[PDB]
């Protein structure tokens, strides 16, 4: 249980993590299925207890970079995955990415989007440069390295309101801006 | 593999009618005495 394996039951060849289910199968039941019509529980046939099936832990991979013109350092997002599992994604089993050089860790960070590696969490907030998600962004900066940060929305400012006070412009600028529509 | 029910059907024919034993066929064997279903799950085993 809890490990990733090529299970078969009765010729139901799948792949997953087996787990002790809390399902009260009625005595005639041997299978349970997903809303999707795929098996997701099954009674063990030699030793009558009920197993949950989960397809083995996995997710999308995405890469963060300042551009080749400036650096060959990149940071990597494991979208939808707590950092502990990433060690569990050791090359002692054959991951779909064969590159596993980032499972060294040391700068490992958890986010709402997943677990982020090769980038450093800096408490200081900046303008969003590369959007990671959920208010986190990343950038390459100072001895350059990739930093990750919660973004700053803009300067905080308390306006000078009072029940009897007014600001008036004594001077102006005549700005010009571009605006480009296809 | 595993199987939920199994049956064997045992009979004799001429060799020139073995082609009629496969599913969805025609000919007097396949029309008047032994028909398989259109989805037939199983295997056909014949010898002189």
């Amino acid at each position: 249980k809890n490990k990733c394996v090529n299970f078969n039951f009765n010729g139901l060849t799948g792949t997953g993590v087996l787990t002790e289910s809390n399902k009260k199968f009625l005595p005639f039941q041997q299978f349970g299925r997903d809303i999707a019509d795929t098996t997701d529980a099954v009674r063990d046939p030699q030793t009558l207890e009920i197993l949950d099936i989960t397809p083995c832990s996995f997710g999308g991979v995405s890469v963060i970079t300042p551009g080749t013109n400036t650096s060959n350092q990149v940071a990597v997002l494991y979208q939808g995955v707590n950092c502990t599992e990433v060690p569990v994604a050791i090359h002692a089993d054959q991951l779909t990415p064969t590159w596993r050089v980032y499972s060294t860790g040391s700068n490992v960070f958890q986010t709402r989007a997943g677990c982020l590696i090769g980038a450093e969490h800096v408490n200081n907030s900046y303008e969003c440069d590369i959007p990671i998600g959920a208010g986190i962004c990343a950038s390459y900066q100072t001895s350059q390295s990739i930093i990750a940060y919660t973004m700053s929305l803009g300067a905080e400012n308390s306006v000078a309101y009072s029940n009897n006070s007014i600001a008036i412009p004594t001077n102006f600028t005549i700005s010009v801006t571009t605006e480009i529509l296809p | 593999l595993c199987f939920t029910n199994v049956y064997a059907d045992s009979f004799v024919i001429r060799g020139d009618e073995v082609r009629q034993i496969a599913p969805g066929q025609t000919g007097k064997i396949a029309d008047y005495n032994y028909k398989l279903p259109d989805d037939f799950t199983g295997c056909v085993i014949a010898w002189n």
Partner: protein, 48 residues
């Protein structure tokens, strides 16, 4: 080779611009197989 090398290979460019980019999803492969079936001991009546 490395995450940059997958991204170059993916964009089919030898030079990658500033951004965030998608790459082949990861999934732990099974360590080994598990087989499980009911234990029966007699063999089926093939001689009959």
């Amino acid at each position: 080779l490395d995450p940059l090398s997958e991204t170059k290979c993916t964009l089919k460019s030898f030079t990658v611009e500033k951004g965030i980019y998608q790459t082949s999803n990861f999934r732990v492969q099974p360590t080994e197989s598990i087989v499980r079936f009911p234990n029966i001991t007699n063999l089926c009546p093939f001689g009959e």
